[PDB]
Amino acid sequence: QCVKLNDGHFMPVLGFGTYAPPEVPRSKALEVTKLAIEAGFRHIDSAHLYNNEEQVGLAIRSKIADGSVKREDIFYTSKLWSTFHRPELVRPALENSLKKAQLDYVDLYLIHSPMSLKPGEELSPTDENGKVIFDIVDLCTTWEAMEKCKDAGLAKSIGVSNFNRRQLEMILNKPGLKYKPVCNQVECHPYFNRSKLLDFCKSKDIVLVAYSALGSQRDKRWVDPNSPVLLEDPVLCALAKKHKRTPALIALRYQLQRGVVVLAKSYNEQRIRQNVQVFEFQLTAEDMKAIDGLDRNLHYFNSDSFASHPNYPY
Ligand SMILES: NC(=O)c1ccc[n+]([C@@H]2O[C@H](COP(=O)([O-])OP(=O)(O)OC[C@H]3O[C@@H](n4cnc5c(N)ncnc54)[C@H](OP(=O)(O)O)[C@@H]3O)[C@@H](O)[C@H]2O)c1
Ligand SMILES: C[C@H](CCC(=O)O)[C@H]1CC[C@H]2[C@@H]3CC[C@@H]4C[C@H](O)CC[C@]4(C)[C@H]3Cc3nnnn3[C@]12C
Ligand code: NA
Ligand code: NA
Ligand code: NA
Ligand code: NA
């Protein structure tokens, strides 16, 4: 169940989200990534920031070595952290991710965020009064370095994450552009459905990939605990009842029917096995209109620590 990207590669339309907070033991990423592959996931979304690429890579290598899948069956995404936007830092950052994951290439390498941070290995640079330290980098030069990673064969495809229309246009208009972004991975769910951005992306043959499609993990460091809980929504729950599915499955299927590639994080064996059932049923045009009606521009991520960054995309 795949979509063709604008560079000719194919992306599975359902992806497994791997982020877990630091209070989850690092062993769990290995267990749940194997469970995801066993359940039928074939797109796996990770990042240098997640501190999990060793365990996620081991899971992938394990399922290839045991004969369950071949390397070409798995679509593995990593992301360039914002302390590595300076062009000379991009290839070493990807090479380090590949060494940790024990992989020869990623299927997809993303710019994690347009909001550049002080260069270096320290992923959370903070000043003498605890403020996040920004950097000013032309993201077109970061992009040129991403392009060289594709030409070196280290990334099959390259894309971006957390870009707005203006930031996408900056790449599309870059002089001497070699490769468009294949995707823009953004926050997208029935409370923030990104309809105009989605329209724009489709018009440029850029795939919108939805994160927080089940309403986020609601980590109180990053998400307002007063925010409404997406999966408690009465329309999603009534549709779940109507279809004998679950609110999560309704929220996933909604994205597939609108041409969005959707991620789903779960570290729970039962919910991992549940989520792959998204391909078993369909929402009517009336159901889709009811879910479109939930849109309220609700951003679970309010990036408060990136206050005043010039590249803040919202
Ligand atoms: N590019 C970026 O900046 C960025 C930002 C955020 C996320 N991401 C990526 O997108 C992924 C997903 O987004 P997310 O981490 O915000 O989480 P999410 O996919 O919105 O999931 C939120 C929560 O839903 C629960 N869940 C999963 N399946 C469910 C089911 N069938 N029924 C009920 N609850 C269910 C999970 O809890 P359990 O684990 O307890 O099942 C999970 O913690 C991340 O892991 C990461 O790979 C990227
Ligand atoms: C849940 C986010 C991860 C999203 C993802 O799944 O890609 C958090 C985890 C780490 C944190 C990083 C962790 C390192 C550092 C911690 C600082 O106190 C705040 C800035 C930040 C870059 C934050 C920024 C942030 N703002 N809202 N969410 N975040 C993220 C990216
Ligand atoms: Na740090
Ligand atoms: Na513009
Ligand atoms: Na458009
Ligand atoms: Na199924």
Author numbering: 6 to 319
From the paper:
Human aldo–keto reductase 1C3 (AKR1C3; also known as type 5 17β-hydroxysteroid dehydrogenase, prostaglandin F synthase and 3-α-hydroxysteroid dehydrogenase type 2) is a member of the AKR superfamily of NAD(P)H-dependent oxidoreductases that catalyzes the reduction of a diverse range of carbonyl containing substrates, including exogenous compounds and therapeutic drugs. AKR1C3 functions primarily as a 17-ketosteroid reductase that catalyzes NADPH-dependent reduction of weaker steroid hormones to more potent androgens and estrogens: including the reduction of androstenedione to testosterone, 5α-androstanedione to 5α-dihydrotestosterone (DHT) and estrone to 17β-estradiol. AKR1C3 is overexpressed in prostate cancer and most breast cancer types, which makes it an excellent target for the treatment of hormone-dependent cancers. Gatekeeper residues (W227 and L54) in the steroid channel determine substrate orientation, while the oxyanion site, consisting of the nicotinamide ring from the NAD(P)H cofactor and catalytic residues H117 and Y55, anchors ketone, carboxyl or alcohol containing substrates in proximity to the cofactor for enzymatic reactions.
As can be seen, under the assay conditions used, compound 2 inhibits AKR1C3 reduction of PQ in a sigmoidal, dose-dependent manner, with a resulting calculated IC50 value of ∼7 μM. Compound 2 was found to display selectivity for AKR1C3 over AKR1C2 and was shown to have no off-target affinity for ERα or AR receptors. The structure of AKR1C3·NADP+ in complex with this C-ring fused bile acid tetrazole was determined by X-ray crystallography at 1.4 Å resolution, revealing that the C24 carboxylate is anchored to the catalytic oxyanion site (H117, Y55); meanwhile the tetrazole interacts with a tryptophan (W227) important for steroid recognition. The asymmetric unit comprised two molecules of AKR1C3 with clear electron density for amino acids 6–323 (chain A) and 6–319 (chain B) and the NADP+ cofactor. The electron density corresponding to the 3D structure of compound 2 was clearly visible in the AKR1C3 active site, in both monomer A and monomer B of the asymmetric unit and compound 2 was modeled with full occupancy in both active sites. The overall structure of AKR1C3·NADP+·(2) is globally similar to other AKR1C3 structures, which all contain a characteristic (α/β) 8 – barrel structure, and a highly conserved NADPH cofactor binding site.3,41 However, comparison of known AKR1C3 structures shows that the conformations of amino acid side chains and supporting loop regions involved in ligand binding are dependent on the physico-chemical properties of the bound ligand. Overall, binding of compound 2 to AKR1C3 relies on hydrophobic contacts between its steroidal core and residues lining SP2, including W86, S129, W227 and F311, with support from Y24 in SP3 and F306 in SP1.
